[PDB]
Paper text:
IpaH9.8 is one of the most well-studied members of the IpaH family and is secreted by Shigella flexneri during infection. Recently, it has been reported that IpaH9.8 targets human guanylate-binding protein 1 (hGBP1) for ubiquitination and degradation in order to suppress host defense in cells.
The near full-length structure of IpaH9.8 (truncated the N-terminal T3SS signal sequence) was determined by crystallization and X-ray diffraction at a 2.75 Å resolution. The LRR domain of IpaH9.8 adopted an expected solenoid-like structure consisting of eight LRR motifs, with both the N-terminus and C-terminus capped by two helices (right). The NEL domain of IpaH9.8 is an all helical-fold structure, consisting of three subdomains: N-subdomain (from α5 to α8), M-subdomain (from α9 to α13), and C-subdomain (from α14 to α17) (left). In our structure, the α8 and α9 in the NEL domain of the IpaH9.8 (termed IpaH9.8NEL-FL) showed a “helix-loop-helix” fold, with the loop region between α8 and α9 being flexible and not observable in electron density map. Structural analysis revealed that Phe395 in the NEL domain makes hydrophobic contact with Ile196 in LRR-CT, which might be important for IpaH9.8 autoinhibition. Further structural analysis revealed that six hydrophobic residues (Ile196, Leu201, Ile211, Leu216, Leu224, and Ile238) located in LRR-CT constitute a hydrophobic cluster. In addition, this hydrophobic cluster forms a hydrophobic pocket in which the Phe395 of NEL could be confined.
Numbering used by the authors: -1 to 0, 22 to 244, 255 to 263, 270 to 293, 304 to 334, 340 to 421, 428 to 497, 512 to 536
The structure:
């Protein structure tokens, strides 16, 4: 809270530090004139200023410093209602006064925004390098963000009364439309052309907005948006893997390669070295023409070849707890498949991974990265359903599990061989019960081996370590 003389002398010193090519002298006269009166407005635009003084008149409600060479703004007056600072070289904004209604800082070098007050009605942040936004106030009816580095459309809320709202997010890096935009009324307009959007969300946007019986928001968009495919985004072994490219099932088994990116390379890692892995990965990973049930399969095909070696010979305790995780994952996939029915702009794999990471803590899914439309209720129900199906189905499931059948195939025979030798049921009772209720209405070939392998898993090989 400076005194008149402090303002004057601070501005006089600030003037003598003028870089040539700027009108600091004129700004001081406008600053003094602003102080001398009760003036709510201060305009220092188009003077090519290289900086503002530290202390600006504390009572002003409008500040225009557009078209200068500013890299920084000082602490803005708390009574500020409208801040025009377009066409500068700003790297950061200060904290915004709480009563701000308008913010024009387009054509700067901004990477981030401070907290937007609740009073903000209009905002122009276009032609910056912003990567993501804070939560936007509801009073915000006009927002222009053209040509930034945004990755995500913000989830709007339908205000209780309908007012015209316009959002320009064109020429960004947005890749995912949130399901929330269909809540909004027709009085709101969204511009998302020139964004790297999926062709799925494109075709969804096409289908819904190109229907009669559509009362949502006006969304403006443009649908205009073999072997050297695998090692690209993980560099060197593109030639090493080409030796394997001259083989079977590589056109739909490699082109279909659409945190996670880190160890998709560490799953690339041993399929790289050993030919045993994807002599059989491409087995059912190319004839499935849902990609989370497959992604789980190649997890399994990975895990059977390890169990083929014998990592779980005496350590079946850690094999069992891993099947507990992988069972809850394959329940989560069915949760995911159930939800994508109701979502338009995402497919199962994305929803699956949303469930996996948002629940990795609560359900102890170690094999998950610690990073959409998934609410808080479908997280609660997802846990309630996996926990109950776990209680009812895990042991039957683990007895049929692949990795464990492998460690029995390697470690500890007898029972394993005996189990296979009890194939009497597959011919002494398999023809009568074959359609014994298919006409009273291979399903029992899965029901019979369940019985024996669970029976094998009655007098288990796990009661030798414990």
């Amino acid at each position: 809270d400076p005194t008149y003389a402090d303002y004057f002398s601070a501005w006089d010193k600030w003037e003598k530090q003028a870089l040539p090519g700027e009108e600091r002298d004129e700004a001081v006269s406008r600053l003094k004139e602003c102080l001398i009166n009760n003036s709510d407005e201060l305009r220092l635009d188009r003077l090519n200023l290289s900086s503002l003084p530290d202390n600006l008149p504390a009572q002003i409600t409008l500040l225009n410093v557009s078209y200068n060479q500013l890299t920084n703004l000082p602490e803005l007056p708390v009574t500020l209602k409208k801040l025009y600072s377009a066409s500068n070289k700003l790297s950061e904004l200060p904290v915004l006064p709480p009563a701000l209604e308008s913010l024009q800082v387009q054509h700067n070098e901004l990477e981030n925004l401070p907290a937007l007050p609740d009073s903000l009605l209009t905002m122009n942040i276009s032609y910056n390098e912003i990567v993501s936004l804070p939560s936007l106030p509801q009073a915000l009816k006009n927002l222009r963000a053209t040509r930034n580095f945004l990755t995500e459309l913000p989830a709007f809320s339908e205000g209780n009364n309908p007012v015209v709202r316009e959002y320009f997010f064109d020429r960004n890096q947005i890749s995912h439309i949130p399901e929330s935009i269909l809540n909004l009324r027709n009085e709101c307009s969204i511009h998302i052309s020139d964004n790297p959007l999926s062709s799925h969300a494109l075709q969804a946007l096409q289908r819904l907005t190109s229907s009669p019986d559509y009362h949502g928001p006006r969304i403006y968009f443009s649908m205009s948006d073999a072997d050297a495919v695998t090692a690209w985004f993980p560099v060197s072994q593109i030639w090493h893997a080409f030796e394997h490219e001259e083989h079977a099932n590589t056109f739909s088994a490699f082109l279909d390669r659409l945190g996670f990116r880190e160890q998709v390379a560490a799953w690339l890692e041993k399929l790289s070295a050993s030919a045993e892995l994807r002599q059989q990965s491409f087995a059912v990973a190319a004839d499935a023409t849902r990609v989370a049930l497959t992604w789980n399969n190649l997890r399994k095909t990975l895990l059977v070849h390890q169990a083929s070696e014998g990592l779980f010979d005496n350590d079946t305790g850690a094999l069992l707890s891993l099947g507990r995780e992988m069972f809850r994952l394959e329940i989560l996939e069915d949760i995911a498949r159930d939800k994508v029915r109701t979502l338009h702009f995402v497919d199962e794999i994305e929803v699956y991974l949303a469930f996996q990471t948002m629940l990795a803590e609560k359900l102890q899914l170690s094999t998950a990265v610690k990073e959409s439309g998934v609410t808080a209720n479908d997280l609660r129900t997802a846990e309630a359903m996996v926990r109950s199906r776990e209680e009812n189905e895990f042991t039957d499931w683990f007895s049929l599990w692949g990795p464990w059948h492998a460690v029995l195939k390697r470690t500890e025979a007898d029972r394993w061989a005996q189990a296979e030798e009890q194939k009497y049921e597959m011919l002494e009772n398999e023809y009568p019960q074959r359609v014994a209720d298919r006409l009273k209405a291979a399903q029992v070939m899965r029901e019979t081996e369940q019985q024996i392998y669970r029976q094998l898993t009655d007098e288990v090989l796990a009661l030798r370590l414990s």
